[PDB]
Amino acid sequence: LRQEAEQLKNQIRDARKACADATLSQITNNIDPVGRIQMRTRRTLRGHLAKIYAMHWGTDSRLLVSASQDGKLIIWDSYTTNKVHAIPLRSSWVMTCAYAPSGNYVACGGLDNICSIYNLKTREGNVRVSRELAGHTGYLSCCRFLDDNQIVTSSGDTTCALWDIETGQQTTTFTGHTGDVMSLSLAPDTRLFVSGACDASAKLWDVREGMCRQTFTGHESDINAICFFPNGNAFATGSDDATCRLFDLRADQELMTYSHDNIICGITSVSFSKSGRLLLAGYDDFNCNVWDALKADRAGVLAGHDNRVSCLGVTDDGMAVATGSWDSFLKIWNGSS
Amino acid sequence: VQLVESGGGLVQPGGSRKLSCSASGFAFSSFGMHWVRQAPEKGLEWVAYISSGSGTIYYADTVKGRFTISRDDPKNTLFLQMTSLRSEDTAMYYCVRSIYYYGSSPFDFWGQGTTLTVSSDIVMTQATSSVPVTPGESVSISCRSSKSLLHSNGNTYLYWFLQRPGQSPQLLIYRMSNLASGVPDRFSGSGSGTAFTLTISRLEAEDVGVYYCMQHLEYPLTFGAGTKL
Amino acid sequence: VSAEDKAAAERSKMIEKQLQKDKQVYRATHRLLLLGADNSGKSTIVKQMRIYHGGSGIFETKFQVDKVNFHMFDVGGQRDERRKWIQCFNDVTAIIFVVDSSDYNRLQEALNDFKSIWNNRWLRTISVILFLNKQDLLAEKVLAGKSKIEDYFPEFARYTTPEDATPEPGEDPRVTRAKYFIRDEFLRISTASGDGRHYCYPHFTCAVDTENARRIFNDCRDIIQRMHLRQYELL
Amino acid sequence: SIAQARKLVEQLKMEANIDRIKVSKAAADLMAYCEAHAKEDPLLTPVPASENPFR
Amino acid sequence: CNVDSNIDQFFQPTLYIIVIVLGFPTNCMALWAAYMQVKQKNELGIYLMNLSIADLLYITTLPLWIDYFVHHDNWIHGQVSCKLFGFIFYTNIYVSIAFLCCISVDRYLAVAHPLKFAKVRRVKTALLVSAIVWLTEIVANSAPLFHDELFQDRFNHTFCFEKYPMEPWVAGMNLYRTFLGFLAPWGIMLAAYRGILRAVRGNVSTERQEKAKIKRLALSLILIVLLCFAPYHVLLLWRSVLFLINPCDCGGEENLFGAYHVTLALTSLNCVADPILYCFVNEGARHDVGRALATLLGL
Secondary structure, rough: OOOHOOOOOOHHHHHHHOOOOOOOHHHOOOOOOOOOOOOOEEEEEOOOOOEEEEEEOOOOOOOEEEEEEOOEEEEEEOOOOEEEEEEEEOOOOOOOOOOOOOOEEEEEOOOOOEEEEOOOOOOOOOOOOOEEEEOOOEEEOOOOEOOOOEEEEOOOOOEEEEEEEEOEEEEEEOOOOEEEEEEEEOOOOOEEEEEEEEEOOEEEOOOOOOOEEEEEEEEOOOEEEEEOOOOOOOOEEEEEOOOEEEEEEEEEEEEEEOOOOOOOOEEEHHHHHHHOOOEEEEOOOOOEEEOOOOOOOOEEEEOOOOEEEEEEOOOOOOEEEEEEEOOOOEEEEEEEO | EEEEEEOOOOOOOOOOEEEEEEEEEHHHHHOEEEEEEEEOOOOOOEEEEEEOOOOOEOOOOOOOOOOEEEEOOOOOOEEEEEOOOOOOOOOOOEEEEEOOOOOOOOOEEEEEEOEEEEEOOOOOOOOOEHHHHHHOOOEEEEEOOOOOOOOOOOOOOOEEEEEEOOOOOOOOOOOOOOOOOOOOEEEEEEOOOOOOEEEEEOOOHHHEEEEEEEOOOOOEEEOOOOOEO | OOHHHHHHHHHHHHHHHHHHHHHHHHHHOOOOOEOOOOOOOOOHHHHHHHHOOOOOOOEEEEEHHHHHHHHHHHEOOOOOOOOOHHHOOOOOOOOEEEEEEOOOOOHHHHHHHHHHOOOOOOHOOOEEEEEEEEHHHHHHHHHHHHHHHHOOOOOOOOOOOOOOOOOOOOOOHHHHHHHHHHHHHHHHHOOOOOOOOOEEOOOOOOOOOOHHHHHHHHHHHHHHHHHHHOOOOOO | EEEHHHHHHHHHHHOOOOOOOOHHHHHHHHHHHHHHHHOOOOOOOOOOOOOOOOO | OOOOOOHHHHHHHHHOOOOOHHHHHHHHHHHHHHHHHHHHOEEEEEEEEHHHHHHHHHHHOOOOHHHOOOOOOOOOHHHHHHHHHHHHHHHHHHHHHHHHHHHHHHHOOOOOOOOOOOOOOHHHHHHHHHHHHHHHHHOOOOHHHHHHOOOOOOOOOOOOOOOOOOOOOHHHHHHHHHHHHHHHHHHHHHHHHHHHHHHOOOOOOHHHHHHHHHHHHHHHHHHHHHHHHHHHHHHHHHHHOOOOHHHHHHHHOOOHHHHHHHHHHHHHHHHHHHHHHHHHOOOHHHHHHHHHHHHHOOO
């Protein structure tokens, strides 16, 4: 049983501190802190119905996909504020959606234990359900695409999985979480993916392999969302305690805590700028907040949303951000100058 | 996908009648149906266009007026009513599908055309008209335009088509440097400003026919008689 | 301003019209959240109203009563460790707690579940409809009298049936007393917090009941009536 | 019970396999990546509106 | 054809200034609260803020009428300030009654038919019908701008449109105005609130305390509207009876002109009653009042 587990886990805890050194905040304080970053709503896509659960930027940094509880999956043109596609989703509690890197497929998860993948660039011109992935006993909570051949999906049965859409069966099942997994992030090289669960623990797996490679502890509540650093060796987790944190992938411990006395309500989604200097956080304070990377200080607020900002995404161009909230409005924020 | 069109043949000048194009299992209720002509042993030319959920019915100034087009989403049929025909309108006809998203493929599928026999704008030149059918080369077709088609968006609006002896012309290069689905990697397109060049990797027996091109900023949709293979 | 971009804008406006129709059909519907145990036969009650629009997890029961349409969303296929779908269900018009009355063993678990419902963070405002089903099973099993109601719940003896009750003519008085004791337990765990924020409506039903849709529609109508009284400053 | 305990103990023992070195190199790489990509962040450095399509 | 000069010298200044000082900030704040109400898409925001402006205009035209009531009748200032502002001040009460009737209709369709009339309960429809009410109340009440002009007498002028001998066209138009601008909207208010009380009686989730409080509020609304507008219109009916085919004998109703100004004084209280009784009653609106005061002080 647990005769040796407690002794064999001692080297896990001391390793994160014995080989560590001073935190990155004091070291990076020598760099110039970014000034008050104010960012304006350049466009508002007031098309959706209900609370917008999740959104995903297209690979072109111009196409958006967003999901609502009614079963609406909408692909917007962000540059002109036009909706390219509207898809009526059958599983009408889609927590998350995603855009395939090739841009031909859009996948939506949800509470209904399945992954619905839809064809965009079909020879017919009408978006039809390409496939449905079944085999998860919990609720799908993140649906990030790996590539056109395979898709990673984490659900509410404390497990994530890697599927191949063409055949359908669960190619690989990653288990090891205690509570339901609420969000995963896929690295830019699409070779490792990190998923965080309600057990206040995150875990990195291997898409080709099947067992966990990294575990991460230090949150005091559910890990509400996780987003990879664009570098690929770090990721940010936003939790219910409003104490969003950054974990270095290799270093295998918490680096610093993004905390303040003003913030009370928890996080709902996290995203990163291309350089990562702008970690935005979709707090439940009814307004997303954009803070720095090296100094861990609040830099601005993307206020303008009546309700909680439920999702947050930075383009692959690193040029704009999109915030989706419970007011059914998607706001595209960009720098004023 | 099928866009097979039906109609009659010979008719008198006072032969106001209807010519239809019927589609197979289709997304017709959300497609911007175009309508193109082709003078015998000559190039193509517009006749009309009706957007999905008709709000922008446009015509060509040559036949604007008497000619009319309409869409029928429930029974999935495109009507063309023609009144007071003249001796010029005798030509091949094609019912063409086209819709536009941020990155859509326009003018993809051309239905099997129908014959009709009866008893400013940007100009497409296509000066070259004869090209050898010798295989194993890298021949290219050059295209002129009245003005640069590169709009401020960042995309050109010129379309390319090949016509083998008997069939409707399948699209090759929508916009520039943007291949369609059925067309293989062999075809290609490039250029800059008012200069256009459709290039071919290798030559085989399926590259024969005439090439055609259309501008799209304004809506004359006129063509230029290309190289006969 | 390009012709292709003009047609793209026309397409976006067509989707805007579709989304306005979508606006109307979403605001013309009221979400309802089923919740209960597996012994409760929630899916049995869902079949009882009407043939459900299947699709596990969602069961998507859209129905109209008296020309008023709304969409209940039966659930139960997800994990029951914490019911984390409740956060997704916080705007729902009402939550239908469905429970059975025959098996006294799980009634303590039913009371615990109702206590968890009535004080949830996302349930501080949502009203609750109580559906006690399989009442005929309870009546028959207590007419047999093999299992005393006193051993599981020692407060039956002190309880005498209230006069406000309107039992059916064929109902035995002890059957009525058991029915209203099992009702009073849930009523008493309900009427302890959030009196004005929500109110738990009780009901008795069985496997076959043609008035399930009418009753649930009336209950949602009362919930909306109170919501409008609060919202429109008439309170 | 037994199966989950076994899964947990193997998970712990092959989690202990990865080596441990100083975090200074990781932090240095982190801020190096942050500073090397500062130019092409239009959010960090607001791009002039003429070429910004969100203008 | 003489001013009563018994109590109207001091009666109007005593309470009209009070109406100013109380109503104006409170009517503006009720406007602001209605803006919060529509901020949450509640069309009662429009139905309340439009009434708030319809009474705020009455307050704005009040101060140059208190000197009018004093022997400086018609206050000179040309015919522009004696005709347009006169129509505004004589029609703001009717627009107020119309908007109260519209609010009552909205509440009746919101509680007694909680989910039937979704097609008429949109904020867009609120603006459409509020503008329609504004248009139809201005057009139907524009008669005094054409045939009614000011007049002056030796003692101290006469009026703007008081018309001690009421012209027959005034009699007809004012009787029609009285009926179809007070009794019909008030009858609609009474019927709608009776239906609302019936529906709340049919409710189950409401205890007896809340039901009785709602009944008290409905009765208070109906009775304040009556106590503020009925004496005026009863007096107008009496003057129509005395100035129909029976000639305007004067003298007898010159003392009744004092009742005219007393009834104007009585009607002036409806302007301050509307915000305190339509917005300030709600406890949630009281918390909104506190937070709005905090925001405006910290703005």
